[PDB]
Amino acid sequence: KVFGRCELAAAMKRHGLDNYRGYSLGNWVCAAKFESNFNTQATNRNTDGSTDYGILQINSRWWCNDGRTPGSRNLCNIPCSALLSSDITASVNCAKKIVSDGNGMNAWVAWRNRCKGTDVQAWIRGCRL
Amino acid sequence: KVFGRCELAAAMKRHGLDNYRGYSLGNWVCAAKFESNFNTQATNRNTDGSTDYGILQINSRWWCNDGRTPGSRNLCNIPCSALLSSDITASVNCAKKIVSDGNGMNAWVAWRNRCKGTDVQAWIRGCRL
Numbered sequence: 001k002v003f004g005r006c007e008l009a010a011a012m013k014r015h016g017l018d019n020y021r022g023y024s025l026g027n028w029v030c031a032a033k034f035e036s037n038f039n040t041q042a043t044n045r046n047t048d049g050s051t052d053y054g055i056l057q058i059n060s061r062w063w064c065n066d067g068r069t070p071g072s073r074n075l076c077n078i079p080c081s082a083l084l085s086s087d088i089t090a091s092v093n094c095a096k097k098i099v100s101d102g103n104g105m106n107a108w109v110a111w112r113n114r115c116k117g118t119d120v121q122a123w124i125r126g127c128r129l
Numbered sequence: 130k131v132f133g134r135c136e137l138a139a140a141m142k143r144h145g146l147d148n149y150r151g152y153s154l155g156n157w158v159c160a161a162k163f164e165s166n167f168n169t170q171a172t173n174r175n176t177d178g179s180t181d182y183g184i185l186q187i188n189s190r191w192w193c194n195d196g197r198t199p200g201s202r203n204l205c206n207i208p209c210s211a212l213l214s215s216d217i218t219a220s221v222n223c224a225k226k227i228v229s230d231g232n233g234m235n236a237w238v239a240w241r242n243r244c245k246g247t248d249v250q251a252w253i254r255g256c257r258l
């Protein structure tokens with residue numbers, strides 16, 4: 001599924017991401033936009049052989065199981081395919097584990113390089129929240 | 130899920146692949162082995178921007194929707210994520226459409242280059258079918 005911007009903001013807020021570890025909702029929407037263009041089915045192969053999955057491009061090296069990332073963990077205890085669902089629950093719960101892991105949202109390279117320090121409020125602009 | 134060889138043979142047979150368009154079950158098991166190493170979560174990006182999904186590496190250019198393959202069809206009328214499920218139904222039904230499409234199993238490049246003409250019977254060797 002490709003979410004609309006305010007649609008995703010609404011789902012993220014319902015699932016507890018607004019100000020989760022101090023990150024406002026616009027940060028998460030911005031992260032999703034550059035990671036996946038709001039597409040829950042987005043996948044991207046990493047040079048190391050791991051894969052990034054879903055609206056927040058969650059990596060198989062640590063977070064999920066895809067059965068093809070040697071010597072990787074599945075800290076969110078989910079199959080990576082779960083991260084491609086129409087329903088963003090698995091992705092949101094896993095993201096909460098990631099963002100708590102010590103580097104906050106710097107875990108998402110696209111966040112640090114394209115969202116961090118910018119006017120993230122704008123990503124929740126027109127939205128009935 | 131990573132299927133065992135006879136496990137997958139059993140699922141493929143239950144779903145009507147044995148001798149489907151004249152291709153014996155060992156052809157389909159062989160195709161799956163080289164496409165995905167029996168891993169329903171396998172994905173592979175194609176240079177054209179399309180993606181191959183699931184145990185039979187079914188391509189987004191024609192067969193499924195992933196919302197990121199411009200000008201592609203979804204002839205099996207399914208989201209590509211469906212092709213990564215533990216349950217191979219969507220993959221099998223879609224494969225039946227593909228293999229009927231005119232080039233038979235030559236649709237799977239790995240089949241034509243690694244299975245075609247070989248002793249495919251061996252792939253269903255130990256299996257209680």
Ligand SMILES: [Cl-]
Pocket residue numbers: 021022103104105
């Ligand atoms: Cl932080």
Ligand SMILES: [Cl-]
Pocket residue numbers: 150151232233234
């Ligand atoms: Cl044929």
Ligand code: NA
Pocket residue numbers: 060061062063064065066069072073074
């Ligand atoms: Na993993």
Ligand code: NA
Pocket residue numbers: 189190191192193194195198201202203
């Ligand atoms: Na498509």
